[PDB]
XYZ file of C-alpha atoms in Angstrom:
302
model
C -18.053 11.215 2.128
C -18.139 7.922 2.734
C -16.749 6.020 6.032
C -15.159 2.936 7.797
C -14.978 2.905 11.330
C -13.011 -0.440 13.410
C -11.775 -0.974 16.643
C -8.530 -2.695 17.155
C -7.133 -4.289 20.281
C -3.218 -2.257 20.156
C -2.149 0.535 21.293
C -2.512 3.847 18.696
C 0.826 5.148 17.747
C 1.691 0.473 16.454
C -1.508 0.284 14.532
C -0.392 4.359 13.289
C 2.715 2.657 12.327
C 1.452 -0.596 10.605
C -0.224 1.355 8.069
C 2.347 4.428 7.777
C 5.016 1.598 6.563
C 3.222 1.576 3.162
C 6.450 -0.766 2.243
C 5.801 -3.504 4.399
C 2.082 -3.655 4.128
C 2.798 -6.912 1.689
C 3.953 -8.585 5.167
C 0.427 -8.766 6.429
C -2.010 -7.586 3.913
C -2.820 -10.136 1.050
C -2.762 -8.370 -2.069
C 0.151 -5.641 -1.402
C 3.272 -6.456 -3.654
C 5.445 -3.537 -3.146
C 5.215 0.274 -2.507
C 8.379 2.403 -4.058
C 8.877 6.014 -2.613
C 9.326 8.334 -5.420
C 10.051 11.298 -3.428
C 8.201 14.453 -2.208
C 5.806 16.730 -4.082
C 5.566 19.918 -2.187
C 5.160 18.010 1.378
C 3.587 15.016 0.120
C 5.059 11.764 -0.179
C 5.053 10.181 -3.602
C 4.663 6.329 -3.999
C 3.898 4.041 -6.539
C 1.854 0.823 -5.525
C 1.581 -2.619 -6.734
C -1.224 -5.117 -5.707
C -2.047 -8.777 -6.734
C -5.736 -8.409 -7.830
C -6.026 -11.891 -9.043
C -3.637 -14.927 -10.194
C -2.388 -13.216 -12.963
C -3.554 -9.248 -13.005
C -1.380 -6.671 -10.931
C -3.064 -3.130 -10.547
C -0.525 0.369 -10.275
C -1.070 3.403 -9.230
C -0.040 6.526 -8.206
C -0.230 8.237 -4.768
C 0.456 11.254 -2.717
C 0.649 10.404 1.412
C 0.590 12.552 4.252
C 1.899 11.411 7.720
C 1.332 13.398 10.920
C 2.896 10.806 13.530
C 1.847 13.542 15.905
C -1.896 13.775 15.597
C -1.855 10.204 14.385
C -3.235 11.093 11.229
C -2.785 9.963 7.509
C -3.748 11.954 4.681
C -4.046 10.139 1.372
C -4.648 10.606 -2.482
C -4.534 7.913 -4.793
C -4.575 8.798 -9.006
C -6.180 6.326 -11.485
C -5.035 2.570 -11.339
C -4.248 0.300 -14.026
C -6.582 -1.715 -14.879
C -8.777 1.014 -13.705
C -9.775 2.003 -10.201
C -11.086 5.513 -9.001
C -8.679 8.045 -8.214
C -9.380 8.435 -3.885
C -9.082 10.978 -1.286
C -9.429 9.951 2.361
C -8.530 10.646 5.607
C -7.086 8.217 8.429
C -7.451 8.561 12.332
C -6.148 6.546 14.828
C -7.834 7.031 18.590
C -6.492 6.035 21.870
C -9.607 3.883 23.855
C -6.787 2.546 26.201
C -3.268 1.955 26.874
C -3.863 -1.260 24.102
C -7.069 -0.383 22.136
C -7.939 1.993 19.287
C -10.017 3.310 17.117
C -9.671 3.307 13.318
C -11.399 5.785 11.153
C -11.117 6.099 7.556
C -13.094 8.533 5.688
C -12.665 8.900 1.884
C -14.517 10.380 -1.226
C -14.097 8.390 -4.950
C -13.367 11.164 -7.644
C -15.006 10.900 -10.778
C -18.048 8.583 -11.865
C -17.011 5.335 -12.765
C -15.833 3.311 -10.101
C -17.270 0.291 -8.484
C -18.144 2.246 -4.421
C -18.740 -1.400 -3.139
C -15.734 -3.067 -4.215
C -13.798 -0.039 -2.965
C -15.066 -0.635 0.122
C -14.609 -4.138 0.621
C -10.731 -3.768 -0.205
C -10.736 -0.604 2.148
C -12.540 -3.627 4.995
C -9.882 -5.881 4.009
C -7.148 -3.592 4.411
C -8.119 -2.522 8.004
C -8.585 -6.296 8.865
C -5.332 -7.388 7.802
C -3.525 -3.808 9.785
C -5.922 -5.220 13.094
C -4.592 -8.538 13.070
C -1.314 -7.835 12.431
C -1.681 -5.348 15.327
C -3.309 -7.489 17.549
C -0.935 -10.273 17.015
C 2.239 -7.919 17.013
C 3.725 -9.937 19.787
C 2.787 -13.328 18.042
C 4.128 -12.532 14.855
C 7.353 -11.292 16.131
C 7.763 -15.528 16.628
C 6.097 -16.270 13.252
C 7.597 -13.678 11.487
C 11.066 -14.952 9.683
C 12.655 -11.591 8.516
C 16.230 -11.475 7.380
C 18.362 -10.300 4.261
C 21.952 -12.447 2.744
C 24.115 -10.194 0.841
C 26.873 -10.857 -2.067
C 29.734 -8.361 -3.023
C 30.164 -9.021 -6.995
C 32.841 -7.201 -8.628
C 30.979 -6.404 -11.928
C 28.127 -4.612 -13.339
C 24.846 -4.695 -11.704
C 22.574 -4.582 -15.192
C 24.276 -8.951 -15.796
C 23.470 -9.311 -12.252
C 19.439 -7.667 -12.342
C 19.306 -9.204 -15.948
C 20.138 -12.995 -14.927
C 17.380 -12.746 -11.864
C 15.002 -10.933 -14.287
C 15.056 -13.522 -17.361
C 13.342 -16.167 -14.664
C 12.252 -18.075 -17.573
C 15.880 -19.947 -18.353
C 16.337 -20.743 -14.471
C 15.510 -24.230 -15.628
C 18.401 -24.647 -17.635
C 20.453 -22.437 -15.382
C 19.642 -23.278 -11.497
C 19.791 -26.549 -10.068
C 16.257 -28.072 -8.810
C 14.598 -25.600 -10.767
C 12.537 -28.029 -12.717
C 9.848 -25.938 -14.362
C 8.893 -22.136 -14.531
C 6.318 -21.119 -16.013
C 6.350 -16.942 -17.093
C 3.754 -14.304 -17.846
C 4.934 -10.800 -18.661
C 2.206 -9.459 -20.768
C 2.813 -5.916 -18.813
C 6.187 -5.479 -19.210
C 8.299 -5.167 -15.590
C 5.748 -7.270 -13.811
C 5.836 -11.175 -14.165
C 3.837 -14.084 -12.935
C 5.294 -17.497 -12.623
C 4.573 -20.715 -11.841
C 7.640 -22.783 -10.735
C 8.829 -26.561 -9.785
C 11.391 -27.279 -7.120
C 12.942 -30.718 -7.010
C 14.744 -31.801 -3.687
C 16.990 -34.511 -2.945
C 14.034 -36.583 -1.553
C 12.298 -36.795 -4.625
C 9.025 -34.853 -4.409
C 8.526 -31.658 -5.797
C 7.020 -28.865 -4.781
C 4.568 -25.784 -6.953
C 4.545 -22.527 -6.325
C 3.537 -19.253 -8.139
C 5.072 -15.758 -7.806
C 4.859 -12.464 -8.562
C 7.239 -10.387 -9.132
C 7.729 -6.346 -9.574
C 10.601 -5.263 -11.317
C 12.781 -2.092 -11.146
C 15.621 -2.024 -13.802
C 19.054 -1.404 -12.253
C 17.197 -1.367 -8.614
C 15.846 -4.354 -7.385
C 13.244 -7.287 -8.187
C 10.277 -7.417 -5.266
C 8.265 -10.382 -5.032
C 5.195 -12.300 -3.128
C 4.254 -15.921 -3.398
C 0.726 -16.000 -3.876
C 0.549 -20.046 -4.227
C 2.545 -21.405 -0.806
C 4.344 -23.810 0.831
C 1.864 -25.770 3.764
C 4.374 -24.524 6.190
C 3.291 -20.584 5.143
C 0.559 -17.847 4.985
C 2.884 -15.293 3.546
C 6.015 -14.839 1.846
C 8.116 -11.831 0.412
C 11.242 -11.181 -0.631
C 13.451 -9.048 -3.336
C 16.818 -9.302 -5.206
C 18.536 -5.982 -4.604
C 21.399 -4.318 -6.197
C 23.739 -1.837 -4.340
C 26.428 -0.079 -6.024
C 29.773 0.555 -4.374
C 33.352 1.444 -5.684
C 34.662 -1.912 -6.124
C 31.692 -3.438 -7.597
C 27.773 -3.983 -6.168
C 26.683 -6.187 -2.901
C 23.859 -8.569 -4.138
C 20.888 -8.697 -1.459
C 18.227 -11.681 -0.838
C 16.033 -10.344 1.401
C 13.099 -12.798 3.007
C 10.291 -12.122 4.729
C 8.478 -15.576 5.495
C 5.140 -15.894 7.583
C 4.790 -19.743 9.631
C 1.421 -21.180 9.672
C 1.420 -22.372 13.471
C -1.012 -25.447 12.211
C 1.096 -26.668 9.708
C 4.205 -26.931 12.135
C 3.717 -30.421 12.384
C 4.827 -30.949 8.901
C 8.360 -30.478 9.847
C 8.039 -34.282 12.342
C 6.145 -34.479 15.872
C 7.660 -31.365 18.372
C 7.883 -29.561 16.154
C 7.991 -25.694 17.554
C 7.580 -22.013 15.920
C 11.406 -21.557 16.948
C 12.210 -25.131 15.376
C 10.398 -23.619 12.133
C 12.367 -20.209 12.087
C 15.365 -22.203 11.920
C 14.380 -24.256 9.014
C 13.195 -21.723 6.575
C 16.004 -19.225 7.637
C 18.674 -22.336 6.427
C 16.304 -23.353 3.622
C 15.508 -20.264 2.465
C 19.059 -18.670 2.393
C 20.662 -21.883 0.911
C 18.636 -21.828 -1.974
C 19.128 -18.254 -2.560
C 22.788 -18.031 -1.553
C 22.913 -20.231 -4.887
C 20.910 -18.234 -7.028
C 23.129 -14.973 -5.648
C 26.394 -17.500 -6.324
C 25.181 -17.895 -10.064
C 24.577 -13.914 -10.654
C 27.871 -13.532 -9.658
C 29.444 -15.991 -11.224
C 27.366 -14.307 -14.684
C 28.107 -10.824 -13.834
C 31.965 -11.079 -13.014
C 32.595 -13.635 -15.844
C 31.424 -10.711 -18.185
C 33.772 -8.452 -16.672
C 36.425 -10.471 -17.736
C 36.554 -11.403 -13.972
């Protein structure tokens, strides 16, 4: 059995929490994309995970979780990723050392022969740094976190809705300022693009996605080139059925850089920041949710 012990400056039961919300570990952890519940097996909980392993290679897997918020324990088994990665079984403890410090203990075994121990470790090192800072700054990121979802009721069918937001590639031709996008979707349901945004000032702007996508669901993505202004941002497209129709949701989660505020003119502060990108941000997807209604209800003959 092999081991990873840290000490983080945050009380237990919020850095038990951090890594118990297996769905929002791509708010603070690099390479998480998404994690999709897929229900219980026999008191387990089922997920299926997604992480960004390079610029254009996505590793899955399946896993079974255990959470005891009680003993602050976590219990976890992960099957055979593709590309390949060991199937895992480990063991996480969180320890009260004070009122705001802890100690992190993961223990795990890799099953089978043919996995690579040290990078298995590393991204187990990584993991625990990214839950530690994200504890440790818990107060700070409640300012630098941006955090906020625009819905859309559209009276039609959700699959000309999901399909418009899925086929990224004709956005060019579809979505004002979208000057260039550049897809990859050699595994089918996960895409990689790069993409061109013109604004009224002339200059335009690169960035690169990825994106998982669920078929009638919703479409989770993770910028993995950003704006200066960023060090992380996530968001989906979500589709929610309802008797008259479906409500359209742009959710964004948006991380500010607190050394790249001056970008936004001298003064700038954190609070003048949240209030661009929460404008900026929803504008430009408000449009994108205007279109896919636009698509979705002309096909249903209105």
């Amino acid at each position: 059995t092999l081991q990873y012990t840290a000490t983080v400056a945050a009380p237990a039961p919020l850095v038990f929490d951090l890594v118990a919300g297996l769905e929002n570990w791509p708010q603070f952890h690099g390479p998480s994309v998404h994690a999709e519940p897929l229900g219980r097996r026999d008191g387990a909980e089922e997920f299926q995970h997604w992480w960004v392993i390079d610029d254009r290679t996505v590793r899955t897997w399946r896993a079974r979780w255990r959470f005891d918020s009680q003993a602050l324990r976590i219990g976890y088994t992960y099957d055979p990723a593709e590309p390949a990665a060991p199937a895992q079984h480990g063991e996480w403890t969180f320890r009260r050392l004070s009122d705001a410090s802890t100690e992190v203990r993961v223990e795990y075994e890799l099953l089978g022969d043919e996995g690579d121990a040290a990078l298995a470790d590393r991204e187990l090192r990584e993991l625990v740094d990214c839950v530690t800072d994200a504890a440790e700054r818990h107060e700070e990121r409640r300012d630098l976190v941006v955090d906020f979802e625009d819905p859309l009721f559209v009276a039609g069918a959700v699959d000309d809705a999901y399909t418009y937001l899925y086929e990224a590639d004709k956005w060019p031709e579809r979505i004002p300022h979208v000057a260039r996008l550049v897809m990859e979707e050699r595994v089918p349901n996960i895409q990689f693009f790069d993409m061109d945004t013109t604004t009224p000032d002339g200059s335009a702007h690169t960035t690169r996605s990825v994106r998982v996508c669920l078929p009638g669901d919703k479409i989770v993505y993770k910028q993995i080139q950003l704006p200066k202004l960023l060090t992380g941002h996530t968001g989906h497209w979500k589709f929610t059925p309802t008797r008259e129709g479906f409500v359209l949701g742009a959710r964004h989660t948006a991380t500010i850089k607190p050394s790249a505020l001056p970008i936004l003119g001298e003064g700038t502060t954190v609070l003048d920041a949240r209030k661009y990108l929460r404008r900026v941000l929803s504008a430009n997807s408000m449009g994108n949710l205007r279109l896919a209604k636009a698509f979705a209800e002309e096909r249903a003959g209105v």
